[PDB]
Design a protein around this ligand. Structure first.
Ligand code: M3L
Lengths: 218, 210
């Protein structure tokens, strides 16, 4: 399996430092230029920095010059990004990406899933979970879970441990004036199933190690 | 690198996404597809070549001041963000375009509306969230007004909308009204009034407390 895995993301106070790591597997790491690319929530891709195989050549965008240092350890098949003096403009999902030298240029042919860096003074807080109870037309009922007052992103919600996926809508979180996030996850199901089928939403907030299972009944 | 924020196309039809730059036709342009929550994936590289594994209906061209990603025979699953990309050797930096969201066109679909009173467990915490759900509609534009005992609410609700569905091309939307429990128990009737192109007249979903 050809893979990049980024780690090290989390909440960092403004002005402080954070080091990201990216572990490669399934290919010859020392043969490739490697990049960091970032994406602020809701915005476009922004390349950040890259480093050649023997680490003699590094390039950065002006916005991170000096503050950021990219390094690599070929023995550990690993890429690193040291980020100092962090600001709110640095808040983003950070991707590890492999550079491919094609016949006519350079592009990214492999990416990790990314790791989220949230630059904030706010404290980490797990969500409260509340039922959205069913109580229905045309043969269809809707039910859900309200996931309230957490920080930072992300939260994941599944239904019946992943067995229920059809008709599920998990909304993008909204930031409340309190500075905390909230979202809902809903599902539509046959209304005739309400008497017999159990519906449980499984909420995971990894930053606070919060796992909640909430049964949603009429 | 300038891209249109949005491109719309019917299933089976052809989408064209542009990437603008002064003499961009002099350098190689590469294109990525990015689905919600996922990493980008290269779909065209060196102007017009296809990575193995990418369907032939993805093609590209590049000339003068414009590069173009063409998606032929568009499917609902092609809804996503698309980015162009170059290497700029005058500044030694990778540059991405601003991104284009591809929206798939379909027929108008009216929302199925549901209202949810606050849970008892939330009321015990001292807050009441009332949720209005608009399910599976098209197009994305919709209006939701909250009325509490027929009084129009403003400033105390927030909306969230899903990305276009990758299979049926609809949207869903939630509107959440938030009151203190103290304020909530002062009123009887809670109502969500929904306006949408697929509805002959506004639809109201409401409940009487208790
Ligand atoms: C790999 N990276 C994108 C950083 C630069 C591309 C290589 C630069 C060029 N081959 C030269 O020798 O001038």
């Amino acid at each position: 399996e050809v893979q990049l895995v980024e780690t090290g993301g989390g909440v960092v106070q403004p002005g402080r430092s954070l080091r990201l790591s990216c572990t490669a597997s399934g290919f010859t790491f020392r043969d490739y230029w490697m990049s960091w690319v970032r994406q602020a929530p809701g915005k476009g891709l922004e390349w950040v920095a890259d480093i050649n195989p023997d680490g003699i050549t590094r390039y950065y965008i002006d916005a991170v010059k000096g503050r950021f240092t990219i390094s690599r350890d070929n023995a550990k098949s690993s890429l690193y990004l040291q980020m100092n003096s962090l600001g709110a403009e640095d808040t983003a999902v950070y991707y590890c990406a492999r550079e491919f030298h094609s016949g006519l240029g350079w592009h990214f042919d492999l990416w990790g899933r990314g790791t989220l860096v949230t630059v904030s003074s706010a404290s980490t807080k797990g969500p409260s979970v509340f039922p959205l109870a069913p109580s229905t037309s045309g043969g269809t009922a809707a039910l859900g879970c309200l996931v309230k007052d957490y920080f930072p992103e992300p939260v994941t919600v599944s239904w019946n441990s992943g067995a229920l996926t059809s008709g599920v809508h998990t909304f993008p979180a909204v930031l409340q004036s309190s500075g905390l996030y909230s979202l809902s996850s809903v599902v539509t199901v046959p209304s005739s199933s309400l008497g017999t089928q159990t519906y449980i939403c499984n909420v995971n907030h990894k930053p606070s190690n919060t796992k909640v299972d909430k049964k949603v009944e009429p | 690198l300038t891209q249109p924020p949005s491109v719309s196309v019917a299933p089976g039809q052809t989408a064209r996404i542009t990437c603008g730059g002064t003499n961009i036709g002099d350098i190689s342009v590469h294109w990525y597809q990015q689905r919600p929550g996922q990493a980008p994936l290269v779909v065209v590289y060196d102007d017009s070549d296809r990575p193995s594994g990418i369907p032939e209906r993805f093609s590209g061209s590049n000339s003068g001041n414009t590069a173009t990603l063409t998606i032929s025979r568009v499917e609902a699953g092609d809804e996503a963000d698309y980015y162009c990309q170059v290497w700029d050797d005058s500044i030694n930096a990778y540059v991405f375009g601003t991104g284009t969201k591809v929206t798939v066109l379909r027929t108008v679909a009216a929302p199925s509306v549901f209202i949810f009173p606050p849970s008892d467990s939330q009321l015990k915490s001292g807050t009441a969230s009332v949720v209005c759900l608009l399910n599976n509609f098209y197009p994305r534009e919709a209006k939701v007004q909250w009325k509490v005992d027929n009084a129009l609410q403003s400033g105390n609700s927030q909306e969230s909308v899903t990305e276009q569905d990758s299979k049926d091309s609809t949207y869903s939307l939630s509107s959440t009204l938030t009151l203190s429990k103290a304020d909530y128990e002062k009123h009887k009737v809670y109502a969500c009034e929904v306006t949408h192109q697929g509805l002959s007249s506004p639809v109201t979903k409401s409940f009487n407390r208790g």
